[PDB]
Amino acid sequence: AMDPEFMDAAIRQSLAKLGVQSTEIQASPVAGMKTVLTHSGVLYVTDDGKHIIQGPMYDVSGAHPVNVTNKLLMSQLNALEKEMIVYKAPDEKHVITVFTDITCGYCHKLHEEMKDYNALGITVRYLAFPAQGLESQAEQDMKSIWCAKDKNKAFDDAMAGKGVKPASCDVNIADHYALGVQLGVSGTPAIVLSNGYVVPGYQGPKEMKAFLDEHQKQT
Amino acid sequence: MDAAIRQSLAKLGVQSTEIQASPVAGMKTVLTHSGVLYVTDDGKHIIQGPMYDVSGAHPVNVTNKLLMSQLNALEKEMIVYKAPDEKHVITVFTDITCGYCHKLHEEMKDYNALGITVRYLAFPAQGLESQAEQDMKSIWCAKDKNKAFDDAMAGKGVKPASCDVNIADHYALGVQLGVSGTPAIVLSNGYVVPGYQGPKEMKAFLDEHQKQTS
């Protein structure tokens, strides 16, 4: 703590020149490179700040390749647990975190199936991801929903077509969005597994259950 | 040997064509037909390219800068339309079935007039085994490549011709450079300008880029 971290200072300065203005810098599993969190994604930067490569980074030593960028990010993701809209399964077999958008068609499709996911042992945890960006009406509307006293009711209501009641709190949707971007989320709904794996596409409950079971076995 | 890197790649179904140094100690530049990977010496970790050097005034894609060796090595297989008073050299990936490639070729005199030399490589979007690939092979195997290319682009059909020219190598290089559609304009430092850009625009862009990277 009394020892200077002057090399990280070079990273920040190097990124500042590029317009990347705020950073979190952590170790990486690769010697002489640091993991750098930015609002625009994860960057792997050499210790001296001179070279940059966009994530993700994969660990390919095992039977299946794993995205260690996303695996690492599950610490950030899990730290946002209190800001999640959680629909817990009675007999929980899997927990997925879903980046969702109240204006996205398959997010409606997915939510309509919540009972069936839950019945199959799948707990669904929601974070907000306005696919149209942070200055869209959806960001504003989702913030109200996430600031409601009953988040589950507000979210249910909105997806049924009832309409959000205004509300404010300290929850920043921009933080959910940055996490989504760092995890490689572009299209919603984006289903993220407990090890960071982002499921390609939408899958209904029966398909998702089999996928989750097999994913657990293999990884 | 790079056994560890090759072992990991083999496990993922990936065939490297080259493995060479990178700017990062302990990590190699690995060329494959699908693109460039950065892989640790121990074969444990992979990040897809490209890598940028950001130490200068402007970010430089060093992956593509490196590939300019591979690219310039293909000199003799390029169809070059030289400007009389050469100010810039650009390499262009083209397809004889691509509308914008035809627009570009029709305007070659204009690019040349502004001091821009154009060097073509083949990039048949339809991939290998396609009719476009074969026809373009025939063109690149002509005794007179410029004549054959002008003739085809003017709509005069394609004359059968055989030689050792491997279009797939052009295609692989384009893919490694980040080319996905044609025409693709590549600068002397590997920078890709995606799509078509006009002679006056290109000249101004080329002049500014030279000032930026000198």
UniProtKB/Swiss-Prot annotation, chain B:
GO terms for cellular component: periplasmic space. Gene3D superfamilies: Disulphide bond isomerase, DsbC/G, N-terminal (3.10.450.70), Glutaredoxin (3.40.30.10). Disulfide bonds join 98-101. Keywords: Disulfide bond, Periplasm, Redox-active center, Signal. Transmembrane segments: none annotated. It is found in: Periplasm. InterPro entries: DiS-bond_Isoase_DsbC/G, DiS-bond_isomerase_DsbC/G_N, DiS-bond_isomerase_DsbC/G_N_sf, Thiol:disulfide_interchange, Thioredoxin-like_fold, Thioredoxin-like_sf, Thioredoxin_CS. Homodimer. Required for disulfide bond formation in some periplasmic proteins. Acts by transferring its disulfide bond to other proteins and is reduced in the process. DsbC is reoxidized by a yet uncharacterized protein. Also acts as a disulfide isomerase. This is Thiol:disulfide interchange protein DsbC.
